[PDB]
Scaffold this active site. Structure first.
Site, mmCIF file in Angstrom:
data_model
loop_
_atom_site.group_PDB
_atom_site.id
_atom_site.type_symbol
_atom_site.label_atom_id
_atom_site.label_comp_id
_atom_site.label_asym_id
_atom_site.label_seq_id
_atom_site.Cartn_x
_atom_site.Cartn_y
_atom_site.Cartn_z
ATOM 1 N N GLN A 198 0.812 -1.202 0.000
ATOM 2 C CA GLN A 198 0.000 0.000 0.000
ATOM 3 C C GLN A 198 0.848 1.255 0.000
ATOM 4 O O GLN A 198 0.614 2.193 -0.783
ATOM 5 C CB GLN A 198 -0.929 0.069 1.197
ATOM 6 C CG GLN A 198 -1.883 1.240 1.066
ATOM 7 C CD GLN A 198 -2.685 1.555 2.316
ATOM 8 O OE1 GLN A 198 -3.723 2.205 2.219
ATOM 9 N NE2 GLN A 198 -2.205 1.135 3.486
ATOM 10 N N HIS A 205 1.980 3.662 -3.227
ATOM 11 C CA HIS A 205 1.408 4.975 -3.007
ATOM 12 C C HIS A 205 2.259 6.186 -3.301
ATOM 13 O O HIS A 205 1.878 7.296 -2.990
ATOM 14 C CB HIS A 205 0.696 5.056 -1.664
ATOM 15 C CG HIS A 205 -0.686 4.506 -1.720
ATOM 16 N ND1 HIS A 205 -0.985 3.321 -2.356
ATOM 17 C CD2 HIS A 205 -1.866 5.023 -1.319
ATOM 18 C CE1 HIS A 205 -2.290 3.135 -2.356
ATOM 19 N NE2 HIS A 205 -2.850 4.155 -1.734
ATOM 20 N N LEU A 257 -6.092 -1.642 -11.559
ATOM 21 C CA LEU A 257 -5.830 -3.038 -11.215
ATOM 22 C C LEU A 257 -5.038 -3.272 -9.920
ATOM 23 O O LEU A 257 -4.946 -4.404 -9.435
ATOM 24 C CB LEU A 257 -5.131 -3.740 -12.375
ATOM 25 C CG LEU A 257 -3.617 -3.683 -12.581
ATOM 26 C CD1 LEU A 257 -2.900 -4.663 -11.671
ATOM 27 C CD2 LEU A 257 -3.357 -4.060 -14.028
ATOM 28 N N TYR A 258 -4.454 -2.216 -9.365
ATOM 29 C CA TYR A 258 -3.681 -2.362 -8.141
ATOM 30 C C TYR A 258 -4.507 -2.108 -6.897
ATOM 31 O O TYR A 258 -3.966 -2.074 -5.776
ATOM 32 C CB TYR A 258 -2.469 -1.430 -8.148
ATOM 33 C CG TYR A 258 -1.158 -2.124 -7.819
ATOM 34 C CD1 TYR A 258 -0.765 -2.344 -6.499
ATOM 35 C CD2 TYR A 258 -0.317 -2.571 -8.836
ATOM 36 C CE1 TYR A 258 0.424 -2.993 -6.218
ATOM 37 C CE2 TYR A 258 0.863 -3.216 -8.552
ATOM 38 C CZ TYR A 258 1.224 -3.427 -7.259
ATOM 39 O OH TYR A 258 2.382 -4.101 -7.018
ATOM 40 N N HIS A 285 -7.787 -3.887 -2.203
ATOM 41 C CA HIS A 285 -8.535 -3.790 -0.941
ATOM 42 C C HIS A 285 -8.902 -5.226 -0.466
ATOM 43 O O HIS A 285 -9.031 -5.479 0.732
ATOM 44 C CB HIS A 285 -9.767 -2.910 -1.124
ATOM 45 C CG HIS A 285 -9.313 -1.500 -1.497
ATOM 46 N ND1 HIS A 285 -9.386 -0.958 -2.786
ATOM 47 C CD2 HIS A 285 -8.662 -0.624 -0.624
ATOM 48 C CE1 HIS A 285 -8.749 0.225 -2.662
ATOM 49 N NE2 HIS A 285 -8.331 0.442 -1.453
ATOM 50 N N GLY A 329 -0.313 -6.536 -15.030
ATOM 51 C CA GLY A 329 0.557 -5.958 -14.028
ATOM 52 C C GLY A 329 2.014 -6.305 -13.985
ATOM 53 O O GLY A 329 2.795 -5.465 -13.573
ATOM 54 N N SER A 342 4.789 -3.458 -13.663
ATOM 55 C CA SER A 342 5.590 -3.379 -12.441
ATOM 56 C C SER A 342 7.107 -3.536 -12.610
ATOM 57 O O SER A 342 7.861 -3.249 -11.669
ATOM 58 C CB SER A 342 5.059 -4.339 -11.345
ATOM 59 O OG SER A 342 5.242 -3.814 -10.014
HETATM 60 C C1 HEM Z 1 -6.723 0.731 5.735
HETATM 61 C C2 HEM Z 1 -6.840 0.229 4.410
HETATM 62 C C3 HEM Z 1 -7.132 1.008 3.323
HETATM 63 C C4 HEM Z 1 -8.107 1.918 3.192
HETATM 64 C C5 HEM Z 1 -9.049 2.406 4.279
HETATM 65 C C6 HEM Z 1 -8.106 2.326 1.806
HETATM 66 C C7 HEM Z 1 -8.969 3.263 1.257
HETATM 67 C C8 HEM Z 1 -8.945 3.675 -0.072
HETATM 68 C C9 HEM Z 1 -9.711 4.799 -0.595
HETATM 69 C C10 HEM Z 1 -10.501 5.773 0.255
HETATM 70 C C11 HEM Z 1 -9.374 4.939 -1.908
HETATM 71 C C12 HEM Z 1 -9.859 5.980 -2.914
HETATM 72 C C13 HEM Z 1 -11.113 5.513 -3.687
HETATM 73 C C14 HEM Z 1 -10.928 5.287 -5.214
HETATM 74 O O1 HEM Z 1 -9.980 4.565 -5.618
HETATM 75 O O2 HEM Z 1 -11.766 5.814 -5.998
HETATM 76 C C15 HEM Z 1 -8.364 3.930 -2.160
HETATM 77 C C16 HEM Z 1 -7.685 3.829 -3.340
HETATM 78 C C17 HEM Z 1 -6.671 2.940 -3.578
HETATM 79 N N1 HEM Z 1 -6.253 1.968 -2.689
HETATM 80 FE FE1 HEM Z 1 -6.742 1.804 -0.804
HETATM 81 N N2 HEM Z 1 -7.124 1.678 1.102
HETATM 82 C C18 HEM Z 1 -6.526 0.873 2.037
HETATM 83 C C19 HEM Z 1 -5.539 -0.027 1.764
HETATM 84 C C20 HEM Z 1 -5.014 -0.259 0.519
HETATM 85 C C21 HEM Z 1 -3.926 -1.168 0.269
HETATM 86 C C22 HEM Z 1 -3.379 -2.173 1.277
HETATM 87 C C23 HEM Z 1 -3.621 -1.067 -1.044
HETATM 88 C C24 HEM Z 1 -2.487 -1.509 -1.703
HETATM 89 C C25 HEM Z 1 -2.061 -2.869 -1.770
HETATM 90 C C26 HEM Z 1 -4.590 -0.159 -1.593
HETATM 91 C C27 HEM Z 1 -4.545 0.261 -2.887
HETATM 92 C C28 HEM Z 1 -5.292 1.275 -3.397
HETATM 93 C C29 HEM Z 1 -5.063 1.856 -4.703
HETATM 94 C C30 HEM Z 1 -4.041 1.405 -5.727
HETATM 95 C C31 HEM Z 1 -5.901 2.919 -4.800
HETATM 96 C C32 HEM Z 1 -5.859 4.065 -5.801
HETATM 97 C C33 HEM Z 1 -4.925 5.192 -5.353
HETATM 98 C C34 HEM Z 1 -4.935 6.368 -6.300
HETATM 99 O O3 HEM Z 1 -6.023 6.735 -6.784
HETATM 100 O O4 HEM Z 1 -3.859 6.917 -6.568
HETATM 101 N N3 HEM Z 1 -5.425 0.363 -0.628
HETATM 102 N N4 HEM Z 1 -8.097 3.168 -1.037
HETATM 103 N N1 LIG Z 2 0.060 -16.646 -10.128
HETATM 104 S S1 LIG Z 2 0.455 -15.464 -8.889
HETATM 105 O O1 LIG Z 2 -0.698 -14.644 -8.560
HETATM 106 O O2 LIG Z 2 0.942 -16.127 -7.705
HETATM 107 C C1 LIG Z 2 1.740 -14.364 -9.525
HETATM 108 C C2 LIG Z 2 2.697 -14.859 -10.418
HETATM 109 C C3 LIG Z 2 3.710 -14.025 -10.858
HETATM 110 C C4 LIG Z 2 3.761 -12.697 -10.408
HETATM 111 N N2 LIG Z 2 4.813 -11.919 -10.840
HETATM 112 N N3 LIG Z 2 5.975 -12.517 -11.423
HETATM 113 C C5 LIG Z 2 6.614 -11.626 -12.098
HETATM 114 C C6 LIG Z 2 7.885 -11.863 -12.757
HETATM 115 F F1 LIG Z 2 7.977 -13.110 -13.151
HETATM 116 F F2 LIG Z 2 7.921 -11.111 -13.805
HETATM 117 F F3 LIG Z 2 8.854 -11.577 -11.887
HETATM 118 C C7 LIG Z 2 5.870 -10.351 -12.016
HETATM 119 C C8 LIG Z 2 4.786 -10.593 -11.227
HETATM 120 C C9 LIG Z 2 3.776 -9.558 -10.825
HETATM 121 C C10 LIG Z 2 4.073 -8.659 -9.775
HETATM 122 C C11 LIG Z 2 3.196 -7.604 -9.473
HETATM 123 C C12 LIG Z 2 2.028 -7.443 -10.217
HETATM 124 BR BR1 LIG Z 2 0.978 -6.014 -9.917
HETATM 125 C C13 LIG Z 2 1.699 -8.338 -11.254
HETATM 126 C C14 LIG Z 2 2.575 -9.402 -11.556
HETATM 127 C C15 LIG Z 2 2.805 -12.190 -9.528
HETATM 128 C C16 LIG Z 2 1.784 -13.027 -9.080
#
Ligand code: HEM
Ligand SMILES: NS(=O)(=O)c1ccc(-n2nc(C(F)(F)F)cc2-c2ccc(Br)cc2)cc1
Ligand code: HEM
Ligand SMILES: NS(=O)(=O)c1ccc(-n2nc(C(F)(F)F)cc2-c2ccc(Br)cc2)cc1
Ligand SMILES: *[C@@H]1O[C@H](CO)[C@@H](O)[C@H](O)[C@H]1NC(C)=O
Ligand SMILES: *[C@@H]1O[C@H](CO)[C@@H](O)[C@H](O)[C@H]1NC(C)=O
Ligand SMILES: *[C@@H]1O[C@H](CO)[C@@H](O)[C@H](O)[C@H]1NC(C)=O
Ligand SMILES: *[C@@H]1O[C@H](CO)[C@@H](O)[C@H](O)[C@H]1NC(C)=O
Ligand SMILES: *[C@@H]1O[C@H](CO)[C@@H](O)[C@H](O)[C@H]1NC(C)=O
Ligand SMILES: *[C@@H]1O[C@H](CO)[C@@H](O)[C@H](O)[C@H]1NC(C)=O
Lengths: 552, 552
Positions: free
Chosen positions: A172, A176, A353-354, A357, A495, A499
């Protein structure tokens, strides 16, 4: 109207409006020709009829431990392998970047304006018959009829890979820095102008802000001692602006760098980690260069940390999230003899796609106590009370949700999951299969194909009707997981490419920067190449707790 | 103090301060080792002992007309040659960019802050003993003791290559999109943020400004008809801010794009050229795509024009300024199978070394009249009265000064030539030889070596004392000209590499952009590849006058 509405051109050929009613496919530099860029040149045929499925690829890669054990031993082999994963994986990225939310055509504004998010697939022309181009109804399913029906969790579904809360919060905090949507402008607009791993999240989004966090001493980042631990400066102290609920004590108001990070103690825990990592480096640098000045130490440190970050994020994070056997390797020199662009521009898809949640538990259980979202969010004393070590430990031991199974989104964050659906629609995204095709995957024949079960399939099929109208976002969380994977092929395929070009396509990874000295010395250089999340914590957290991105 | 003051590390090895009094050379990825990166690995030896001097290279290239004729006929050969000139020439550039005025060390600020000019050689540490590091006196020669003694012109010296005024003003207008020093911030700071051939000069430095010049009709740029010819909109009309003397009639006040271009009628002549070129394309595009809208036609046009510009600037401009025999070729696909970074960042050296004022005549003679600087500068009626064709013709026939002979700077522009000297000093530049070495040239043994004559040599030798303290800038104009060249090896060697990565290292040159359609069609694509300054004029100027970058 736009004749390219129907996405006629296959195999990557660019489609173009030759006369209101007409279009032409720019099959140039594809492996196919003929009106739609579909009939192959023999060489293509040969490639194709000799290419293994990402799954047939995944199988090998996840099986045969012993063999991979042998490979991981032979350095002059591991590297060959690494080199390949690297090279091929990213042929799928248009860098220099093409397209964004307002440009379906190449355009120089689409190339210049760094305020946008690049976009793997051009948006759907605003004059099309249906939102998915030509297929579907005047409207699409309702968000909640997908959000509730196919996406909201019932019972907490645990990840089958043992992704803990250390990993969960890392993915996260890390993503971010690049993901930073400038909503004021709209979705498709970013604020992570440095499109990539610029560690802006630790160092302030600018120079001005970066200054308001720096001690301007020994290259150090400002910090503060609470009881005995180093915690970030206060907004009150260092006027660096932050985002905090109008009641937070003003002593909570930690500074850290990325303005949102104060809204979740997990985030704030990780910033406090890195904040400390900087100084720790700064001192090492400071006694390798007793004659360096603050500005040098500071500027060299940020480079090292970034160096470390790319290591952890490949050697630990990708390594875990992959579940391979083969040992991935952060080694910039591997790409040195190959064509590569040490340049990147983050797309909107990668952002969308990232949204993992589904990783989120229903309780933030810091051993010997469990908190509700309501309690964990924006909390001062949680972290300050429990301590870092008692966070590292809690999180090492705490299964996080499986992502791409189906219906596992915390009813709390259901709102976010909502937005995602109807926002990616605003940004005029394309059908789930056009994307699958785009990333050299085979489009699905049924919702059933997508899900690997019948219940949801029929629920979605009910809503979407055509499989070719299924959306990239939902289809991703309600997608059939590869074996005991955290998510399926579709997620993993769009992804992976995205990535790696953000990690590798980074100046320090360049042959011009990748040498000792750039990092203050051989010393600094050998910090990047000894990095691990395990060390990051043992070096920075009160104990020296064992940690991982897996639930022990 | 800084132990790296004396530039110890040779052969590119980066030098590093290992303890106040000490330093180490990062010979990594050089062809040499040993404390100073000087002793070669055998392979090196082999290359070195088999590499031909830029002159021994130049000779062949300028001689043997007939052979080169044969080559220029054989397409499968010309390309081989072109590909090579391309490939090798630019191995000398640090892209991704390293350094700038404030960064002698790699730094992320040096990489991020696009407001700077990259710098081929790091500045001299502000704590050094002498301004040239360690060699020289507490100060350097006076500017005027160099400006006057060795740089100011006496009799107008004509370029031996027949560079006309068409070329002269082209080289000014063209380089003036990338060169744009933000003096308010200081030298070393640019405003051409799109570091490269972004045709910003025609289209406004922004989006906001670009809008204030467009018609928002048929993709067209705004213009205005004066008597019968299209001339740029007026600042009064299109509120696009310009730079004009507080007396200019407010009817002069032409808009064009690059805010300075109004200060010289030659510039303003060329902007009027391009302004018209845009529209001309827009119509072609407009009847190729009767269904395109203004924004598309506009966005596709800027791309085609840029395409043309890269053609002319290689096929005509470089081709003329080179005086080869072999026919250079703008063919982006030549670099497609080679490692190449379609990325660029303009350095301060490129800017400095490009101050080709010596090109300037003492009278701007538009056939049947000759104007003084005083008259030509900021003039409305000159252009409007004479007409474009009577500018094209005057300029085709008008020898421009030789550049690197010695003492040929217009006493008017002596002030500029002065600045250059004492400004590049401000920016803490390095010795003429460090640069020569940097660009794989052999440092000079005497001022006499530099000049090829005895008079100036001794005058400079008097001033500078050590040859190793001669400056990059002056030594460039008072440098011995290769045969009948406009300038010598030093100018030609630092600049060739810099001038190709800005052309080739441009998104449209990329394999993702280099295809028809990107330019609206096969049609648009076949405008870029049929471009010439000859056509640029015959298509846009009232007659269809013959033209060139040579004096007929
Ligand atoms: C306490 C946990 C979390 C809360 C409460 C939270 C809440 C939110 C909220 C309020 C949004 C904006 C809504 C939208 O996308 O339209 C959001 C966006 C997003 N969240 Fe979370 N989130 C949490 C954890 C995470 C985690 C663990 C990841 C990453 C693995 C994640 C990835 C994302 C991503 C990629 C977006 C879009 C960010 C952007 O617009 O730049 N979130 N989240
Ligand atoms: N089948 S699986 O879910 O366990 C799984 C299998 C492979 C991967 N992996 N491997 C590579 C690599 F090979 F290129 F290194 C990139 C990613 C990757 C990393 C981040 C994102 Br975002 C998307 C893909 C991830 C999940
Ligand atoms: C009528 C002729 C010209 C006049 C009156 C003129 C005048 C000037 C002046 C006033 C400056 C700013 C002083 C400074 O650099 O500190 C300048 C800068 C410069 N000139 Fe010229 N110039 C002319 C022609 C040319 C030509 C033909 C070239 C190009 C081949 C040239 C290249 C430059 C460069 C590269 C700079 C720096 C621009 C920047 O700072 O971005 N000049 N000139
Ligand atoms: N001996 S000379 O003075 O006549 C002379 C010889 C060659 C060149 N030339 N050739 C090339 C090419 F071969 F790569 F195309 C690039 C340049 C070039 C262009 C602009 C600048 Br700025 C610097 C160099 C220029 C002058
Ligand atoms: C492209 O698709 C259209 C669908 O209307 C079809 O008419 C055309 O023949 C197809 N061309 C190829 C090469 O598939
Ligand atoms: C990017 O484009 C949008 C829309 O044209 C505009 O609002 C914004 O100002 C642009 N950003 C920059 C830095 O030009
Ligand atoms: C914040 O934490 C405190 C003590 O750790 C707890 O009492 C409180 O309920 C939490 N905040 C919220 C909103 O629940
Ligand atoms: C390396 O060059 C530096 C120049 O300052 C000099 O002090 C040193 O003695 C040289 N060493 C060798 C082995 O040439
Ligand atoms: C670049 O650096 C200068 C000096 O630090 C600063 O004034 C300017 O704001 C910086 N530009 C950007 C875009 O950060
Ligand atoms: C401008 O040009 C006009 C006509 O070409 C000339 O008479 C006048 O002297 C020029 N302006 C100046 C200030 O010399």
């Amino acid at each position: 109207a736009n004749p390219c509405c129907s996405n006629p051109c296959q195999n990557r050929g660019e489609c173009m409006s030759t006369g209101f009613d007409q279009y032409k496919c720019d099959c140039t530099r594809t492996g196919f020709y003929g009106e739609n860029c579909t009939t192959p040149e023999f060489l293509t045929r040969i490639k194709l009829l000799l290419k293994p499925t990402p799954n047939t690829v995944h199988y090998i890669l996840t099986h045969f431990k012993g063999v991979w054990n042998i490979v991981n031993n032979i350095p002059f082999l591991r590297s060959l392998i690494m080199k390949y994963v690297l090279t091929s994986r990213s042929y799928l990225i248009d860098s220099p970047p093409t397209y964004n939310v307002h440009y379906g055509y190449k355009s120089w504004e689409a190339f210049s304006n760094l305020s946008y998010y690049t976009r793997a697939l051009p948006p759907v022309a605003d004059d099309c018959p249906t939102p998915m181009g030509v297929k579907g109804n005047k409207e699409l399913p309702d968000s909640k009829e997908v959000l509730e029906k196919v996406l909201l969790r019932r019972e907490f579904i645990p990840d089958p890979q043992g992704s803990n809360m250390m990993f969960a919060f890392f993915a996260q905090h890390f993503t971010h820095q690049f993901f930073k949507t400038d909503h004021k402008r709209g979705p498709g607009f970013t604020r992570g102008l440095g499109h990539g791993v610029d560690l802006n999240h630790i160092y302030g989004e600018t120079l001005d802000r970066q200054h308001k966090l720096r001690l301007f001493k020994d290259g150090k980042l400002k910090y503060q001692v609470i009881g005995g631990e180093v915690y970030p400066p206060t907004v009150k102290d260092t006027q660096v602006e932050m985002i905090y609920p109008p009641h937070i004590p003003e002593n909570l108001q930690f500074a850290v760098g990325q303005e949102v990070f104060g809204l979740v103690p997990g985030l704030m825990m990780y910033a406090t980690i890195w904040l400390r990592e900087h100084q720790r480096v700064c001192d090492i640098l400071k006694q390798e260069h007793p004659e360096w000045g603050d500005e040098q130490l500071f500027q060299t440190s940020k480079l090292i940390l970034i160096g470390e970050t790319i290591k952890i994020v490949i050697e630990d994070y990708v390594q875990h999230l992959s579940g391979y056997h083969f040992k991935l390797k952060f080694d910039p020199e591997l790409l040195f003899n190959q064509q590569f662009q040490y340049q990147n521009r983050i797309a909107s898809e990668f952002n969308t796609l990232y949204h993992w949640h589904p990783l989120l538990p229903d309780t933030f259980n810091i051993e010997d106590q469990e908190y509700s979202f309501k309690q964990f969010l924006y909390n001062n004393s949680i972290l300050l009370e429990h301590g870092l070590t008692q966070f590292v430990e809690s999180f090492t031991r705490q299964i996080a949700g499986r992502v791409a199974g189906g219906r596992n989104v915390p009813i709390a964050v259901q709102a976010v999951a909502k937005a995602s659906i109807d926002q990616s629609r605003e940004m005029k995204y394309q059908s789930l299969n056009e994307y699958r095709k785009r990333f050299s995957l085979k489009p699905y024949t049924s919702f059933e194909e997508l899900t690997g079960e019948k219940e949801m399939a029929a629920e979605l099929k009910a809503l979407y009707s055509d499989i070719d109208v299924m959306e990239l976002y939902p289809a991703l969380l309600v997608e059939k997981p590869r074996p005991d994977a955290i998510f399926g092929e579709t997620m993993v395929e769009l992804g992976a490419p995205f990535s790696l070009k953000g990690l590798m396509g980074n100046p320090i990874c360049s042959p011009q920067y990748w040498k000792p000295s750039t990092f203050g010395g051989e010393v600094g250089f050998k910090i990047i190449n000894t990095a691990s999340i395990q060390s990051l914590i043992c070096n920075n957290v009160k104990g020296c707790p064992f940690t991982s991105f897996n639930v022990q």
